[PDB]
Structure 1
Amino acid sequence: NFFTEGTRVWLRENGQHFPSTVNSCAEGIVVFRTDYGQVFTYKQSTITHQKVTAMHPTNEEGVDDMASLTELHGGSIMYNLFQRYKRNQIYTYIGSILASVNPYQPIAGLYEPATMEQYSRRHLGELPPHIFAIANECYRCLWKRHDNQCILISGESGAGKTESTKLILKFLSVISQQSLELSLKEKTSCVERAILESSPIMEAFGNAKTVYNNNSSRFGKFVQLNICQKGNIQGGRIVDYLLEKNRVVRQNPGERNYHIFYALLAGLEHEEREEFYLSTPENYHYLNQSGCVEDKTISDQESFREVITAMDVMQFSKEEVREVSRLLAGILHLGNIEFITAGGAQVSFKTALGRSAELLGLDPTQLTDALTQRSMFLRGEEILTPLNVQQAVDSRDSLAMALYACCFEWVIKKINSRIKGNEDFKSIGILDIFGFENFEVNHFEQFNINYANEKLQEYFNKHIFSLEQLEYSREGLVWEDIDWIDNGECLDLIEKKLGLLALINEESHFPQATDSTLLEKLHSQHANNHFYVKPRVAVNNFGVKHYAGEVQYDVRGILEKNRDTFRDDLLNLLRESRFDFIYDLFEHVSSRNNQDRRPTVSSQFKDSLHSLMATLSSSNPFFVRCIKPNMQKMPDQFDQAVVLNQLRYSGMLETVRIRKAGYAVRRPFQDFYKRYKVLMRNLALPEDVRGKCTSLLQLYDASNSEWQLGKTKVFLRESLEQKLEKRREEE
């Protein structure tokens, strides 16, 4: 096991194989330097085989498809991504699955229109791996397959899911324009322009700075593009999931509120700024509590200009844009209302109340009364009761959240109205969720986000491993099952009867229950569950062993957040608005007054995720796995421990194994024969269809290792299908 200076070796250390070089070998000491800059020293006598092994020559600053790898260990997989990342190749295939490592910098030529053009005219595998090749293959599947397609993008907060989604949309929008024979109706619709302009609007209203991402998505998005038989986008539909409405009124230290507030304050002209009584973001409680009002990566004034342009494309009138500006200004002033205790909560600093009442079209005495008192009618006289200061603050904040959430819903409705079109043929759906996040302090918001990420990982495992191997078994293929990391029991802990969501919902329906009584119930029921953590010291927390790591959640605020109560006194007040825009938002809204069962945030979200997964189940999926190379948002900094952790927990190692050994493409015998009949013209074919399929497959892969015949289908590897598709097009 002796290797001379400069020899390339795999060094087994710290539970992995390190790509390394022999630095020195003298006086019975051997020093290895890893490609990651770690230096490991040993007594030469202690080095044996398997501990140190020679590395396979070159093979050669990486491989494009990791199913091509001979060494399948985590060290080999990560080294391939590292070699490629160092030369700005952030994309690697695993069959048709795409790995994307966030470069945290622009890369010359990578997303230029000349590159988009090049990918549109090639087959998957002909060019270097790229998100444009996946978008193109997905698009080609609308004529190669019989179903709708979907692209699902996974990753922690900051991994690159939102950037990936926008790149796919830009590529499809460009390709939609290449389509023939483009009618004047379809050329003048500007529907692709509107679809692309939906992103700056939704990011301004739904994204915010967090520790993991200066542009974190605080809602989930599913974008459906309806494509005609001729290949042109006819229109689309956007579905939003669980906006983080509590961000409007409170943020963690160092975070910001939604981008749009800072854009509005930096972007409005002096006249409109004075009309809405607006000053700097520091002047507003809803924007100043976190201690951060700016970020060097964001020009808030430039974002405002971008939002204005996008809203014009989206057919928001100039008056509608002003109404949205006025509502946001009203919310900012509302947040500055302070209360003192005399009775009874009383408004202290009356200026903010007067400004907010004017901007919201409310009478100031009516707004003061609604925030400081509760009303009830008893056959048939009104009985006014004082609220305390915490109840007045909760009322002020619920008003701010309701205004923002209804305004966001209206914005999404307007986008959907603009991009609405025919659905005559097929669709491509793209899922952009909020990513996995584990902060210093996690609340109900992180619980819901991490649950959605857990659900998406279960969806990835179901398609890549579970349904895939079940199909091989049902078809009678020669196959040895590949084990995978199954997160099913974590979802069972969250979703089953007596599970986390069930207990949270049950406690929410009890008026006397508190976050403290909820925690006692969570601990009592689940202390022995392997996926649940009862903290030894942190008295306000519970933990969940998520697929992406253990997360501790502070229970404080869970019941109030889950109930999501809105006082009928405030709903009645909003309906008094003289500002038609505000009245229109609350005109037909259902009552959510405290009860003395109504859907909760958890019950509606569980239903929305189950409905989403059902939509995705009917489509053919493409998977993109975004990987963060480091936790410092740095370019050219591949932190191997951070990368390896994501590769391992996400099941990338087993994914390479199943894509390498398995057969991801399948067609019934007659379907295969009818599709590729042109490629069989020089073959002496037998009478039976199974024999006809075998003759073509043996011609294109004589090793007989890239395909198998099942009971009803031909099964083949993606590399063989790409080889057959390229030749079919040529003929």
Structure 2
Amino acid sequence: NPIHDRTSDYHKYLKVKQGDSDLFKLTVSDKRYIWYNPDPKERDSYECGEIVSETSDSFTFKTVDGQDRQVKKDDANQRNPIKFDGVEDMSELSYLNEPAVFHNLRVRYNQDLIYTYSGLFLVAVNPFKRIPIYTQEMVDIFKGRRRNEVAPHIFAISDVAYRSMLDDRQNQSLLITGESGAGKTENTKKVIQYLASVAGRNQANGSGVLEQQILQANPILEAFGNAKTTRNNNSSRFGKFIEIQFNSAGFISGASIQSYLLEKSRVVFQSETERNYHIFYQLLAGATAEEKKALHLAGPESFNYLNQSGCVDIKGVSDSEEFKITRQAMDIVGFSQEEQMSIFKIIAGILHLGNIKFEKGAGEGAVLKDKTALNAASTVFGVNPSVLEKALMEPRILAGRDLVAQHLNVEKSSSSRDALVKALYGRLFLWLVKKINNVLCQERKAYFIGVLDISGFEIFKVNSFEQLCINYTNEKLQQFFNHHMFKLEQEEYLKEKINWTFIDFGLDSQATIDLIDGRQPPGILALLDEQSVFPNATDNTLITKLHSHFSKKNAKYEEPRFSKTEFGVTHYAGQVMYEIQDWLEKNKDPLQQDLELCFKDSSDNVVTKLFNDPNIASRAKKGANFITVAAQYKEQLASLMATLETTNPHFVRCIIPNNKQLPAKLEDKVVLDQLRCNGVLEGIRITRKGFPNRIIYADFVKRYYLLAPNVPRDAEDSQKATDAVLKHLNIDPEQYRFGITKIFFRAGQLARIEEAREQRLESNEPPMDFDDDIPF
């Protein structure tokens, strides 16, 4: 067994290295140490000092240099006995404080051990380097193992979820949190892998093929939906809820993906040093010359949407090599060889349209002198060039009931062309997602395990509407954790009347969540929508309204003194200053009907669908206007949170080590912030200070029954049989507390008492054998 062979890759890569004699001499030392601050100014930079002397309320230690300071014992950050350094579960630490909890993560991380448990939830500090812990071999190890039996691993919590789904017959979900570039997506993938191989049919195409498809899906989505931002080379610019469905038996019956809030302004604009979506870069430098000549493609720097950020390559990635993998996945899912081409015709077309140059006519209406790009785009799109032209600069609109044709100036024509682009892409993602889900969804599920993988919290120099929506979400998920961890939990202890003194773990971002989506009184997204429907409304009228409502009124809000177009929101992960520029047209999402009228008329069977399929081209109507971006997302989100609330949640807090995407560089001010706002320690204090073990006296007969002399799975009070089954074994009763519909146990006490009789081969079935028919 690899688990026990201290030679296996399992031991080499998942277990902490055996120490040496010097270490032992140290581990048994009688000395006591303190975690202190060499420089008060910098709280998060700690040094280990030896406690030299003490008094009733204070410790006195010597610093690294040699000077001695004291500190009242209450404000002392005691260092845990070094036999703890490396603990796979910080729930066990004797002293639970920031430097102590950070030192364990340092120790383990310096050993390439990225996983550690902080109670019921797992932790994952980005390695920023590959580690052989996700092989089929490591998959097999974890399958069917109790969490205690094995080391912390994304595969463990997955399995744990699985058993719980099968056992309680309750749907489950894996919520992976983290800021931008912390591992969420990487860990997301492992959950599927493990879940696909462990609960899959061993390949009967349908179930070994259905699984290959499920697996081949993500690369597709990551090709058109991910990109290089200044915080991650593979940033997920759209969230998603992946659902893995199981039949009543417990085998993978199917899966379905639900995309969310895709940053579609990226196709037309990328900040300095970033990249458009990979998809463009792959097809461009990865397509056959024959294909290269059919879409009139050329060098990335030739296309306006790709040559502006000053970055066309990603250190370590081969767009051509990646382009292949993409086509490889499209085939596994089911995409036709025809469909795929359109996909690229549409992408080539999105590039050409962006090259289109509008110029001032003799008058103020813009003109197109060069038709080269206009026709290239129209050509591969199956549309009519002159129709497109007229649609771009002279869109017909209604004046009351009149039909007036507009004549956009350069500025307005450009923006229209961009609206076309973005609209084109957004539909395609949707479609690609839509198309895909029909392959993977072909049987009514019995149960499912949801895997939420969103865009993490981000703070760029210019933060717009997308960034507000993104952080709004990251704030919503965070509260989902708080609620479940402290709110629901404590609320459970209160009525049981278990005599639980309420604790306020100081974690609650309701004020911030309210300032954004609240309706009455109106939060930010409310006034925004309201401004979005008023005729003579402008960005200025908007920030002013926001200011008007919240400046010097709301605590999570701030009106800057250095700007008249930015407003600051205080998030759990930090304050974020938002530029209000373009929020109106962004929230309205405009597109000229003539353009939409121009594409429905497309010869290409893929494009046509984008503008004709109602669930692709349509848009809800909110009375006299269409539904706003801010309104549907709030709606989509609320729907998810509704879906989430109906499951049993498993948390995984991913932690970025530094801000340089570098391995072996765990910066401590960075890590500590994350652990702080994430509420990790608080997440640990609650499991320690609480009784998380709980079962009614009915299910008490499930495992604790014959414990004792006489006292079976049957009785007419099981509350009578309670204090008799453990009392006989005299289990500390100060460990549990019998409040009243069921009974609680403290800190995995159910476990020690479990193995008391669990790993009991003494009478477990080796009494039959003593005076058998061995008597004559």
* Superposition TM-score, scaled by structure 1 size: 0.91
> Would you say the 8 A contact 1:101–1:627 is kept in 2?
yes
What per-residue deviation string (whole Å, max 9, x for no partner) do you get for residues 633-662 of structure 1? 111111111011111111112111001122
Aligned match of 1:281: 300
Q: Secondary structure at the match of 1:450?
A: helix
Structure 2 distance, partners of 1:100, 1:474, is 35
Aligned 8 A contact 2:261 2:633 in 1: yes
Decide whether the 8 Å contact of 2:33 with 2:48 is kept in 1.
yes
- Give the Å deviation of 1:631: 0.5
Match of 2:518 among 465, 484, 496: 496
Structure 2 vs 1, CA of residues 568 and 87 (structure 1 numbering), >3 Å: closer, same or farther? Answer: same
The answer to whether the 8 Å contact 1:119/1:127 transfers is yes
Identify which of 243, 246, 267 aligns with 2:262.
243
Q: Which range moved further: 694-703 or 584-593?
A: 694-703
The residue type equivalent to 2:382 in the other structure is G
Pair 1:612 & 2:665 matched: no
Mark the CA change 1:701 to 1:372 in structure 2 (over 3 Å): closer, same or farther. Answer: farther
Cα distance in 1 for residues equivalent to 2:78 and 2:639: 51
Letter matched to residue 199 of structure 1: N
Alpha-carbon distance, 1:701 to partner: 8.5
> Residue deviations 1:574-597, cap 9 Å, x none?
112122221121114236999994
User: What is the deviation of 1:538?
Assistant: 2.1
Counterpart Cα distance in 2 of 1:429 and 1:437: 24
Aligned to 2:733, the other structure's residue is in SS state coil
Contact in 2 for aligned 1:101/1:628 (Cα 8 Å): yes
Q: Contact 2:45–2:668 (CA<8 Å) still a contact in 1?
A: no
Specify the code of the residue in structure 2 equivalent to 1:570. L
2:190 alignment partner AA: L
Match of 1:136 in 2: 159
Cα drift, residue 669 of structure 1? 2.4
Q: How far apart, in 2, do the equivalents of 1:407 and 1:475 lie?
A: 53
Aligned to 2:177: 154
8 A contact 2:34–2:61 mirrored in 1: no
Which one-letter code corresponds to 2:475 in the other structure?
E
Contact 1:567 1:594 in 2 (8 A): no
Asked if 1:267 is matched to 2:267, the reply is no
Letter in 2 for 1:668: I
Is 1:715–2:744 an aligned residue pair? yes
Q: CA deviation at 1:192?
A: 1.3
Question: Displacement, 1:507?
Answer: 0.5
1:191 is matched with 210
CA spacing shift, 1:231–1:349, aligned 2, 3 Å: same
- Give the alignment partner of residue 703 of structure 1, picking from 723, 732, 757: 732
1:340 paired residue number: 359
Shift of 1:439: 0.9
| Counterpart position of 2:224 | 205
Question: Which one of the candidate residues 443, 448, 468 is aligned to 1:427?
Answer: 448
d(CA) in 2 for partners of 1:7, 1:673: 43
Cα distance change on mapping 1:288 and 1:695 into 2, 3 Å: farther
User: Given that residues 49 and 61 in structure 2 are in contact (C-alpha distance below 8 angstroms), is that contact kept between their aligned partners in structure 1?
Assistant: no
Name the structure 1 match of 2:56.
none
Tell me if 1:69 matches 2:93: yes
How far is the alpha carbon of 1:369 from its aligned partner?
Answer: 0.7
Change (3 A) 1:421 1:62: same
Per the alignment, do residues 42 and 599 of structure 1 end up closer, same or farther by CA in structure 2, a change over 3 Å counting?
farther
Distance 1:714 1:594 in 2: 51
The equivalent residue for 1:38 is none
SS at match of 1:288: coil
The answer to whether 1:622 aligns with 2:647 is: no
1:169 aligns with 2:192: yes
Deviates more, 1:638-647 or 1:707-716: 707-716
1:442 aligns with 2:463: yes
Tell me: CA distance 1:695–1:294, structure 2 relative to 1, closer, same or farther (3 Å): farther
Match for residue 558 of structure 1 among 580, 583, 590 = 583
Residues 379 and 86 of structure 1: is their aligned pair in 2 closer, same or farther, counting only changes over 3 Å?
closer
Go from structure 1 to structure 2 and tell me whether the alpha carbon gap of 1:459 and 1:535 turns closer, same or farther (over 3 Å shift): same
Q: Is the 8 A contact 1:266 1:300 kept in 2?
A: yes
Cα distance in 2 between the residues matched to 1:680 and 1:30? 50
1:346 Cα deviation after fit: 0.6
- TM-score, L = length of structure 2: 0.86
Deviation per residue, 1:155-189 (Å, 9 max, x gap): 00001100010011111111013x6xx7957545x
Deviation of 1:132 (Å): 0.8
Which residue number corresponds to residue 37 of structure 1? Answer: none
Report if the CA contact (8 A) 1:125-1:722 is conserved. no
Cα shift readout 1:484-527 (whole Å, capped 9, x = no counterpart): 22101111111223211111111111121111110111111101
State the one-letter code of the partner of 1:360: F
More divergent stretch after superposition (674-683 vs 448-457): 674-683
Deviations 1:375-401 (A, max 9, x none): 147999964331111110111001111
Gaps of 5+ in 1: 34-40
Q: How many pairs are equivalent?
A: 711
Query: 3-state SS of the aligned residue for 2:163?
Result: helix
- Select the residue among 483, 486, 489 that pairs with 1:468: 489
Partner of 2:417: 396
SS for the counterpart of 1:667 is: strand
**Does 2:135 correspond to 1:112?**
yes
- Asked if 1 retains the 8 angstrom alpha-carbon contact of 2:367 and 2:393, the reply is yes
Counterpart of 2:702, as a letter, is: R
Q: CA deviation at 1:707?
A: 3.3
Say if 2:374 is the partner of 1:353.
Answer: yes
Distance 2:640 2:317 in 1: 32
- The superposition leaves residues 415-449 of structure 1 with CA deviations (integer Å, 9 ceiling, x where unpaired) of 10010132342110010010000111111110000
CA contact (8 A) 1:287 1:293 kept: yes
Q: Give the 3-state SS of the residue equivalent to 1:479 in structure 2.
A: coil
Query: Matches of 2:300 and 2:729 in 1, distance apart?
Result: 65
Q: 8 Å contact 1:151–1:621 — kept in the other structure? A: yes
Q: Distance in 2 between matches of 1:127 and 1:435?
A: 29
Distance in 2 between residues matched to 1:593 and 1:339, nearest whole Å? 32
Deviations 1:532-584 (A, max 9, x none): 01111022100000010000000001111001112111111111212222112
Moved more, 94-103 or 374-383: 374-383
- Output the CA distance in 2 between the equivalents of 1:713 and 1:17: 46
Change (3 A) 1:286 1:424: closer
In structure 2, distance between residues paired with 1:272 and 1:582: 19
Letter in 2 for 1:74: E
User: Structure 1 residues 568 and 721, CA, compared in 2 at 3 Å: closer, same or farther?
Assistant: farther
1:576 aligns with 2:605: no
